[PDB]
Amino acid sequence: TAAAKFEMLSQEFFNSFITIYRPYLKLTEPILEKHNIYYGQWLILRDIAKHQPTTLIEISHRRAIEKPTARKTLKALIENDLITVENSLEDKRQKFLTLTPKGHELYEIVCLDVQKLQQAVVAKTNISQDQMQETINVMNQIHEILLKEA
Ligand SMILES: NC[C@H]1O[C@H](O[C@H]2[C@H](O)[C@@H](O[C@H]3O[C@H](CO)[C@@H](O)[C@H](N)[C@H]3O)[C@H](N)C[C@@H]2N)[C@H](O)[C@@H](O)[C@@H]1O
Numbered sequence: 001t002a003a004a005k006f007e008m009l010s011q012e013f014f015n016s017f018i019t020i021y022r023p024y025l026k027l028t029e030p031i032l033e034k035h036n037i038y039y040g041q042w043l044i045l046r047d048i049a050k051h052q053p054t055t056l057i058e059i060s061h062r063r064a065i066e067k068p069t070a071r072k073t074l075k076a077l078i079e080n081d082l083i084t085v086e087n088s089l090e091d092k093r094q095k096f097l098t099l100t101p102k103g104h105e106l107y108e109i110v111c112l113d114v115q116k117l118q119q120a121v122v123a124k125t126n127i128s129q130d131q132m133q134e135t136i137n138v139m140n141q142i143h144e145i146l147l148k149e150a
């Protein structure tokens with residue numbers, strides 16, 4: 001349920017990359033399942049790690065989600081002692097978030113596995129380090145038009 005829980009040339013172009021996303025989650029899912037953590041949770045955990053100290057506000061915006069799912073997910077991450085909250089007396093949404101030592105352990109373990117899984121998939125294809133630096137360039141152009149719009 002880890003991947004499950006997270007529930008014309010141009011047509012063939014957007015399809016090559018927009019249809020790889022779920023197989024992908026289904027493949028990298030066990031990595032997460034092994035740390036008793038879900039995708040949504042994990043995506044949040046990673047966001048806190050790349051930008052801590054951060055706050056729900058900041059996280060919602062960056063991640064591009066709704067405070068309700070962001071907040072409900074943050075609570076579990078907390079509930080599971082993977083991130084901390086600077087104890088003040090402001091509103092939860094404004095407080096600071098940081099990974100707990102536990103969370104760093106987990107995070108770093110997951111990171112290392114994904115990288116390994118990913119390096120493996122490439123080593124099973126004819127793709128070159130050129131094709132990968134060149135894919136990224138096509139890709140980023142698109143990712144830009146999508147964000148510089150939304
Ligand atoms: N808001 C929607 C989000 O959709 C994606 O979901 C991403 C998670 O990061 C991955 O999580 C872990 O598995 C991946 C497999 O390698 C790794 O790439 C990643 N570093 C690991 O953390 C997850 N499995 C799929 C995908 N990567 C983007 O990432 C994120 O930016 C974007 O905003």
Ligand SMILES: O=C(O)c1ccccc1O
Nearest residue numbers: 056071074075085092093
């Ligand atoms: O329950 C919390 O401690 C909490 C903290 C930050 C953001 C949302 C929350 O529910």
